[PDB]
């Protein structure tokens, strides 16, 4: 024949991405999450994303609460609309969430819907209309355009891309997070 095929188990690291994302949102000040020291932290024979919901709760990670801005963004996401008005609302939404709730973890379908994928929104600058993304399937943190992040949100929030195991999909935060109120002299 000239056909040689070995039969071996495959593991995707997509399933490990929720653990990385959990560390991002639970950690502070460039350290790791202090309660790290279970299958939880295993590469092989660990906990798949689809199974992680109870563990997220136990780490005081919760879905972001309902709000007018969030309702408005979801409506635009469902309608597949992007314009200056949607972008203004997106900026206001991401800014409020980052300020008040801290870094967000997004759990979403992979493009093509094979696997779930977790990544984090860690920062925003209105000066350049870019979002700081920590996606552990990349080699490093990346600043991405608003439209590129909007496309990621579309997979999590537009009904075209959702099914039953997608109840876990959405935006999460560290329930322990409190903003630090800075004072300036001038």
Author numbering: 21 to 32, 41 to 65, 72 to 220
What does the publication say?
In S. Typhimurium, which infects a broad range of hosts, another effector, GtgE, plays an essential role in virulence. GtgE is encoded within the Gifsy-2 lambdoid prophage. GtgE is a cysteine protease and contains a Cys-His-Asp catalytic triad. The critical base was identified as His151, the nucleophile as Cys45 and the third residue as Asp169.
Expression and purification of these mutants resulted in high yields of both constructs, suggesting that the mutations did not disrupt the structure. Our structure of GtgE shows that the enzyme has a papain-like fold, composed of a slightly bent seven-stranded ß-sheet with two ¶-helices on the convex side and three on the concave side. Through this swap of their N-termini the two molecules form a tight dimer in the crystal. Since the molecular weight determined by the SEC-MALS of 25.5 kDa indicated that the protein is predominantly a monomer in solution, this swap is likely the crystallization artefact. Comparison with papain and other papain-like enzymes suggests that helix α1 in GtgE is longer by one turn on the N-terminal end and starts four residues earlier. We conclude that the function of GtgE in vivo as a proteolytic enzyme is likely dependent on other factor(s), such as a protein partner or interactions with the SCV membrane, which cause a realignment of the catalytic triad to its active conformation stimulating GtgE activity in vivo.
